[PDB]
Amino acid sequence: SMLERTINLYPLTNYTFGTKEPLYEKDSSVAARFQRMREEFDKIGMRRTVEGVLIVHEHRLPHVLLLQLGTTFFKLPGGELNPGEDEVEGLKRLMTEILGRQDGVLQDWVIDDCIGNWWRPNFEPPQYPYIPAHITKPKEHKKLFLVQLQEKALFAVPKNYKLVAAPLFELYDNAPGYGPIISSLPQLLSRFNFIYN
Amino acid sequence: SMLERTINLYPLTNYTFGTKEPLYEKDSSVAARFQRMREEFDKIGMRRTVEGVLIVHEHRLPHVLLLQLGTTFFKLPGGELNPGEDEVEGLKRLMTEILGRQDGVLQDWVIDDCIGNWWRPNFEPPQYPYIPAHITKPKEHKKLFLVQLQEKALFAVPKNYKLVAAPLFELYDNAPGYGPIISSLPQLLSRFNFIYN
Ligand SMILES: [Zn+2]
Numbered sequence: 478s479m480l481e482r483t484i485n486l487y488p489l490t491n492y493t494f495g496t497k498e499p500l501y502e503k504d505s506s507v508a509a510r511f512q513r514m515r516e517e518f519d520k521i522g523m524r525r526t527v528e529g530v531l532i533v534h535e536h537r538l539p540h541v542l543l544l545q546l547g548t549t550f551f552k553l554p555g556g557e558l559n560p561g562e563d564e565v566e567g568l569k570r571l572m573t574e575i576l577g578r579q580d581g582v583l584q585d586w587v588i589d590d591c592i593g594n595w596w597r598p599n600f601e602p603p604q605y606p607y608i609p610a611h612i613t614k615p616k617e618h619k620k621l622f623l624v625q626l627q628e629k630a631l632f633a634v635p636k637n638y639k640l641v642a643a644p645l646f647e648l649y650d651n652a653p654g655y656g657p658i659i660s661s662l663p664q665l666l667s668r669f670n671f672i673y674n
Numbered sequence: 675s676m677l678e679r680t681i682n683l684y685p686l687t688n689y690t691f692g693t694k695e696p697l698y699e700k701d702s703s704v705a706a707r708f709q710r711m712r713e714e715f716d717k718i719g720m721r722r723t724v725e726g727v728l729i730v731h732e733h734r735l736p737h738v739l740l741l742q743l744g745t746t747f748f749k750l751p752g753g754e755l756n757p758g759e760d761e762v763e764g765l766k767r768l769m770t771e772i773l774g775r776q777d778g779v780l781q782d783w784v785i786d787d788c789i790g791n792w793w794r795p796n797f798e799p800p801q802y803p804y805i806p807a808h809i810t811k812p813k814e815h816k817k818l819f820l821v822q823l824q825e826k827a828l829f830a831v832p833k834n835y836k837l838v839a840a841p842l843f844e845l846y847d848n849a850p851g852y853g854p855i856i857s858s859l860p861q862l863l864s865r866f867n868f869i870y871n
């Protein structure tokens with residue numbers, strides 16, 4: 478009766494948050510966003526997204542690193558795979574593009590754990606942790622991975638974002654604030670045995 | 675990039691649901707329930723509970739087996755560990771007592787996966803997927819395990835309960851109906867690769 482995965486956490490002050498040039502979104506509006514999803518659905522089929530959950534602690538409390546676009550939406554580091562691209566190689570590529578260093582030193586990402594699957598049935602905001610009834614052609618499939626951080630690292634945050642450390646209690650039961658994927662991270666992380674280093 | 679645990683599911687019509695004698699709760703009221711939790715906290719410290727998530731399918735849709743007490747509360751099969759009792763040996767004991775056969779043939783339970791941890795800070799209903807801020811002496815610790823069923827089995831359901839098969843969509847976003855632990859099973863099960871046999 479020890480069936481829990483053991484995960485090392487490190488103090489938030491072990492990490493350095495530098496800056497770099499703005500990184501802009503592919504879509505300048507919700508309307509544009511759902512227009513491009515329709516155009517690519519017809520060319521290459523279901524959109525495949527990957528997202529990384531990076532965890533630290535301070536005074537032995539776990540926090541999730543979220544990206545805040547200006548003072549607007551909160552999001553996980555991640556993005557869209559290319560057709561034929563490996564899910565894990567793709568998440569590493571995407572996290573290097575977002576938080577990789579201005580001095581071009583190669584970050585060592587460790588990804589060994591799936592934590593969830595979400596599905597978007599239509600060209601619309603709703604997403605579910607299962608393929609809903611009667612849906613044969615889902616429009617997006619999103620996969621969440623736990624990213625084990627090294628003891629220390631330097632991250633370069635695009636100047637148009639802030640990297641914030643959110644305690645679990647602030648996420649919990651807070652879908653209006655964060656939406657249904659980030660609001661359910663406390664439940665999804667409860668199975669891990671965290672070591673507070 | 676295959677980091678998902680693979681789980682075999684079987685059709686609900688593969689299983690037989692027999693009956694047996696009523697099984698009564700230790701507490702005849704909420705008030706009694708929280709009174710006994712206080713008395714045992716003082717004698718043996720934090721209550722340790724274990725709960726099992728049993729999954730089937732029909733026409734390739736996953737369903738969770740829930741116990742319904744009369745036409746009142748829904749609950750997972752499980753209960754309270756004794757002091758010094760192994761969590762997994764204890765869940766097997768508890769599931770044999772609840773659903774074990776009237777003919778005394780030994781059910782083979784397979785338990786290889788933790789899916790969650792919940793904590794009760796006070797002698798009161800609220801439970802959280804983490805130890806909340808300022809809480810040093812939690813009053814209950816609850817652990818959820820995925821139970822892999824065999825291809826076929828006969829279960830004996832106490833006459834005061836019904837064993838119901840709930841589709842995920844009915845649980846999803848339905849805390850008022852089911853409470854916060856069962857309502858978040860769809861999120862907690864999304865990481866598995868289910869085989870629909
Ligand atoms: Zn400290």
Ligand SMILES: [Zn+2]
Pocket residue numbers: 596615617618
């Ligand atoms: Zn899919």
Ligand SMILES: [Zn+2]
Pocket residue numbers: 732733734
């Ligand atoms: Zn069928």
Ligand SMILES: [Zn+2]
Pocket residue numbers: 793812814815
């Ligand atoms: Zn505990």
